[PDB]
Each structure stands twice: as structure tokens, then as C-alpha cells.
Amino acid sequence: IVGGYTCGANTVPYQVSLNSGYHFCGGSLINSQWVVSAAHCYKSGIQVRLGEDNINVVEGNEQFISASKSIVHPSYNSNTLNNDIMLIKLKSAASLNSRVASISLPTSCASAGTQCLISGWGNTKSSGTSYPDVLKCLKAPILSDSSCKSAYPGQITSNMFCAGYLEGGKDSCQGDSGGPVVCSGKLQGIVSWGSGCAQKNKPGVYTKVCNYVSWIKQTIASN
Ligand SMILES: N=C(N)c1ccc(CNC(=O)[C@@H]2CCCN2C(=O)CNC2CCCCCC2)cc1
Ligand SMILES: [Ca+2]
Predict the structure, then answer these.
(1) What is catalysed by this protein?
(2) CATH number for the domain formed by residue range(s) 1-12+103-210
(3) How far apart are CA 181 and CA 4, in angstroms?
(4) 1-12+103-210 with 13-102+211-222: one CATH topology?
């Protein structure tokens, strides 16, 4: 997260860290046994870390749970990042509490201008690298269809939306991938891609979760 702020410990209680001996992606808890992340975050040996603030210190309230299933959208395309979504099942259910909580799936798609909360342990710099220990937050609006396609012509599918700031300075970045875009209490986006981070005229691109609610429910019920 570039140009954001320290969230505060466990202020984003649905935010998880995906760990493979290091933090490599984010995700969102949607029930005590399932996490929503990005398909480009797939790998084997995923450990899900819930209740995190400082990812480099055991502070209390952490739950480490291995993934027992990682389900990439069958129609995920790694070149276009269309359908950049993955469902991860926990080997055991998480213990739900004020610091470890699920986030609601949306009832409807959000509209342009809608202000959202984007969070992660990703890169905090626009050029060069700096990774934080504690969770970072960014408030960002969803942008219009037209501006999004203007910014990335021929690359925006009906499963992507843009959010952020055309003026540069504030964005998600590498490491934030798979993390939440939450708007009005609902999971509307997944950190997916963009050109660089926080560059002018290149806003973040996010998986449009409202298009997958049925998929998510049908898949979970079947697994
Ligand atoms: N807000 C940001 N600027 C932001 C930027 C990058 C990321 C992490 N995601 C990525 O780095 C992804 C994963 C594989 C290559 N990524 C890309 O960003 C590449 N995107 C492509 C090529 C452009 C035309 C269609 C889209 C596919 C996350 C956030
Ligand atoms: Ca910790």
C-alpha cells in the first residue's frame, strides 16, 4: 500500500496474510473455513495467517492455519488476469472473534465514486521497495467504466474495475495482491494488477467480486 496509513491492530479483522515462509499475498475471510484471494496468488504450501497486525512478530491473536484446498477460477487467464480469483479452504475452521472476522459478499455491484477500504502488507513505495511489518490501509474510490478503459485500453474486462487516484501517490502494490477492496461493508474487489504502483494515470485494477458471488457460493457448497 502506497500513500496509505497504519490501519491499527486488528481494525481490518477479515484481512489475512498468505504465508510460505514469508508474506506473499493477502486475502479476505468470508467464513470460518474459506478465504477469498487472487488466482495469481496460487501456489502450494499456503499457510493462512489470520488476526495479524505485525507480520514479523507473534503479538497475540494470530491463528496460523494451513490451506487444505486452493481453488483457482477454472477460467483464470494468467496473461490477461481475467477471473483473477481463488478460493482457499482452511484445514480447520478459524475461531471467529473481534480480531478474526468474516467480511460479507456483496448483494449488488458497487458504483463509480463509491469509497472503499484497501489494505495490505505490500510495497509502500512507488519506486523501489519497502515492506511494512504492520497492516496498511488506503481509502480509495471506484472509478468510472470510461476512465478505467481510458487508462488501460483493451485490457479491462467485465470482471475488472479501477479504484484509486489518477493523480499518483496512492495505490495498492505488489504484496497486496489477493487482498480486500471493501466498500460499505461488502467485499467488492480483490487486489489484482496495475502498471507500476501509484503512477499517474494508472490506477489500481481489481477483480469485480460481485460477478462471482454465485460461483463462490456454488463452489463452497460443493467442497
Ligand atoms: N495498484 C497497483 N498498481 C497494483 C499493481 C500490481 C499488483 C500485483 N499484480 C500483478 O503484478 C499482476 C500479476 C501478474 C502480473 N500482474 C500485472 O499487474 C500485469 N497485468 C497484465 C498485463 C496488462 C494487460 C492485462 C492485465 C495483465 C497489484 C497492485
Ligand atoms: Ca503477528
Answers:
(1) Preferential cleavage: Arg-|-Xaa, Lys-|-Xaa
(2) 2.40.10.10
(3) 14
(4) yes
Which residues does residue 49 pair with via DSSP β-bridges, in sequence order? 17, 64
Q: Which of 81, 124, 138, 170 to mutate to test the pocket of ligand 1 (most atoms within 8 A of CB)?
A: 81
Distance 191 CA to ligand 1 centre (A): 9
**Cβ–Cβ under 8 Å, residues 197 and 172:** yes
Q: How far apart are CA 101 and CA 43, in angstroms?
A: 24
Pocket of ligand 1 (CB under 6 A): 40, 80-81, 155, 171-174, 176-177, 191, 193-194, 197, 204
Residues near 155 by beta carbon (within 8 Å), at least 6 away in sequence:
80, 205
State this model's resolution in angstroms.
1.9
114: CB partners within 8 A, 6+ apart: 141, 142, 183, 184, 188
Give the domain ranges of the chain: 1-12+103-210, 13-102+211-222
Classify domain 13-102+211-222 at the CATH topology level.
Answer: Thrombin, subunit H (2.40.10)
C-alpha cell at 187: 467485499
